[PDB]
Structure formats: C-alpha cells, structure tokens
Amino acid sequence: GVTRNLPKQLTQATQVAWSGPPPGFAKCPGGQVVILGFAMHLNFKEPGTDNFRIISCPPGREKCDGVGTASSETDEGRIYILCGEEPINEIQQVVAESPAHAGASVLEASCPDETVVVGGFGISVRGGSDGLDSFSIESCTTGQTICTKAPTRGSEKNFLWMMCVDKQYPGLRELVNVAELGSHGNANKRAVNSDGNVDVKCPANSSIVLGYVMEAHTNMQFVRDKFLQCPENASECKMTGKGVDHGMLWLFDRHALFGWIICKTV
Ligand code: NA
Ligand code: NA
Numbered sequence: 001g002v003t004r005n006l007p008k009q010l011t012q013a014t015q016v017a018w019s020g021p022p023p024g025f026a027k028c029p030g031g032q033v034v035i036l037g038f039a040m041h042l043n044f045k046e047p048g049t050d051n052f053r054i055i056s057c058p059p060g061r062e063k064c065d066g067v068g069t070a071s072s073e074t075d076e077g078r079i080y081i082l083c084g085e086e087p088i089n090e091i092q093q094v095v096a097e098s099p100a101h102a103g104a105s106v107l108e109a110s111c112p113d114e115t116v117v118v119g120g121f122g123i124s125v126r127g128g129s130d131g132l133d134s135f136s137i138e139s140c141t142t143g144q145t146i147c148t149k150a151p152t153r154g155s156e157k158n159f160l161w162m163m164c165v166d167k168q169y170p171g172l173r174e175l176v177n178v179a180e181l182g183s184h185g186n187a188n189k190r191a192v193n194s195d196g197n198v199d200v201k202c203p204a205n206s207s208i209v210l211g212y213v214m215e216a217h218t219n220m221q222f223v224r225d226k227f228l229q230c231p232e233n234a235s236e237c238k239m240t241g242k243g244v245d246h247g248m249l250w251l252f253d254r255h256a257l258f259g260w261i262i263c264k265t266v
Contacts, residue, residue, distance in 0.1 A: 001086060006118070006171040007264035010035075010209045011232050013084040017212055019224035022075055023066035026057075028083035034061050035088055037081035038095070038161045041068025044218045044254070048127045049103065049157035051075060054095050056161060059087035076220035078227050080212050090166045091118065094147075097159040106150045111164035117142055119177040120162025121260045122149025127156070129218055129247075132184065132254040139179035139260060142172065171264075176206060179260040186252035187217065187245040195241030195255065202235050202263035211261030213239035218253035219246050230261050237261055 003009055013035055018026035022041045028034060037057030057064030057079070066077040096109035103124070111117060120140035125131060134155040140147035140162045149158040165172060183196020198213055208230050215226030222244045230237035237259055245253045 004170050006165065006169050007174045007209060008171065009088060010082065010262065011264065013082045015210055015229035016081045016083060017227050017229045018079040019227045020077055021070040022068040022077035024077035024079060025063045025065045026079035026081050027063040028081060032083035032085060033087065034059050034064055035082045035084050036091055036093055036163050037064050037079065039064055039066040039077065039079045041066065041075065041077060042220055043075045044132050044216060044220060045074040045129055046072060046127060049100055051127065052125050052157055052159060054097065054159045054161050056093035056095050057081050073221050074219060078214065082210055090169055092164050094164060095161045098157050103156040103158060104151055106148050107158035107160060108146060108148045109160055109162065110146050114167060115164035116167050117144045117147060118163040118165050118172065118175060119262045120147055120160060121179050122147060122158060122160030124149060124151055124155035124158045126154060130254060132216055132218065132256050135184065135216060135256045137179045137181055137258050137260065139177035142175045142177060174265040175209065176203060176263050178202065178263065180258060182257040183241060184256035185254060187241065187255040189243050189245035191241065191243040193240055193242060195243040196257055197238060197240045198257035198259050200237045200259040200261050202261065206263035206265050207233045207235055208237060209262040209264050211237055211259060213237050213259035215239065215241050216256040216258065217244060219244065230259065
C-alpha cells in the first residue's frame with residue numbers, strides 16, 4: 001500500500017464483529033478483503049472442552065468462514081475481522097490450543113522466524129454450566145517472539161490467537177495491547193442491560209487502534225448483540241451485561257464481560 005506504518009494501516013481498516021450459530025461467516029464491506037481476524041466456536045453450557053476453538057481468518061478473502069458445528073442451541077460462533085483494500089503481507093497469524101485433558105500446563109505459541117508479536121490474546125475456559133467460573137483472558141505483548149497462556153481458576157483448556165510481523169515494520173513500537181476481565185459470576189436477569197460491565201482502557205497518551213468487547217454467557221445464543229468492535233481513537237472500550245439468566249429454579253447462568261484492544265501512541 002501507499003502507507004508503510006502499522007498503527008495507521010490498522011486504524012484505517014474496517015472492523016467487523018459477527019455473532020451467530022457456527023460455523024458462520026463475517027463479510028468485509030464491499031470491495032475490501034481480510035487483513036487479519038479470528039473465528040471462535042464457544043459453548044459455555046455443554047460439558048468438556050471440545051466446543052472451544054479459535055482459528056485465524058486468512059488474508060485476502062472477502063469473508064472469514066468460521067469453525068465448529070451447531071450441535072445444540074448453546075453452540076455459538078463469534079467472528080472478528082479487520083478489512084482493507086489489500087492484505088498486509090508482512091503480517092502472519094498464529095493460533096494454538098491445548099489438547100483435551102492437557103489444560104493444566106502452559107500453552108505457548110511462537111511467531112514465525114524473524115517476526116515479532118503485534119498483538120493477540122489467550123483465553124482459558126472450562127465446560128459445563130458453571131465453567132465460566134474458570135474464565136480468564138491475557139493479552140499477548142508487542143515485540144516478543146512468543147505468547148503464552150497459563151491455566152488459572154480451575155480451567156481445563158487454553159487457546160490463543162496472535163498476529164506477528166517482520167521485526168523492522170515501521171510503527172510497531174507505537175503499539176500496546178490491553179485485555180481485561182470485567183464483571184463475572186452469576187448473571188442477573190433483572191439488571192436491565194446493566195448486568196455488570198467491562199472497561200478496557202488504553203494507557204495514558206495512547207488511543208484505540210482496534211479491539212472488541214464481548215459478554216460470555218452460559219447461553220451464548222441469547223447475548224449475540226453483546227459482541228462489538230472497539231472505537232478508533234477512543235481512550236477506552238466499554239460494554240454492559242445484557243441481563244439474561246435461563247437457569248432453572250435456584251440455579252444461575254454465569255457470565256463474563258471481557259475484551260481486548262490494541263492502542264497506539266497519540
Ligand atoms: Na478502523
Ligand atoms: Na446457537
């Protein structure tokens with residue numbers, strides 16, 4: 001492209017966040033193609049860890065196709081893409097996940113030879129109706145050659161997605177990643193669109209390039225609207241919980257508001 005400057009190129013590209021039954025797909029605006037992105041399959045009700053998956057969105061396509069199958073209503077897809085006129089060929093994406101029953105160890109992923117981290121995030125999870133009690137998110141760190149995610153809070157699976165770039169790419173040093181876990185625990189269906197919040201903040205003197213916020217929920221099929229891109233050049237990205245709870249009798253659905261951004265120096 002005419003601009004060789006990673007903060008500017010990433011800010012000017014269009015973000016798209018899509019929710020629906022998996023695998024699904026998210027489409028770039030007409031005339032644009034994928035630069036980077038991810039597709040998730042998530043299910044925070046059914047047992048086990050097979051229903052958690054992240055894959056990268058390959059560049060240069062008009063859409064990003066998702067992953068996983070719609071076996072129950074509680075299976076959901078969440079797809080995030082950044083679209084522009086052409087790919088940034090210096091970017092390479094990496095995903096990793098732990099095997100079933102190998103979640104007690106630290107997950108590690110490395111950038112391809114001679115590249116370094118632009119950004120990304122890792123998540124740890126557990127299945128079952130209470131499994132969001134073990135949810136965590138950690139950002140990857142710009143300028144490293146690796147990203148890792150460690151188990152915590154009783155989690156049984158780790159997964160991560162990151163973007164890497166040639167080490168000399170202009171402007172890389174101006175970028176910083178932030179991930180946040182906000183309100184989490186039992187959901188409250190009487191807090192009208194006000195069931196806790198997440199507030200992902202840039203460090204002082206930086207503003208948002210891209211990112212997203214999401215409500216994770218036992219019943220993901222009822223919080224599809226709670227998945228949104230983060231606003232360019234804002235100081236923070238915020239979202240409230242919807243206030244949804246399909247638990248029977250005395251049982252509460254669980255939720256977790258979380259997000260991830262890349263910020264750039266102002
Ligand atoms: Na943008
Ligand atoms: Na579904």
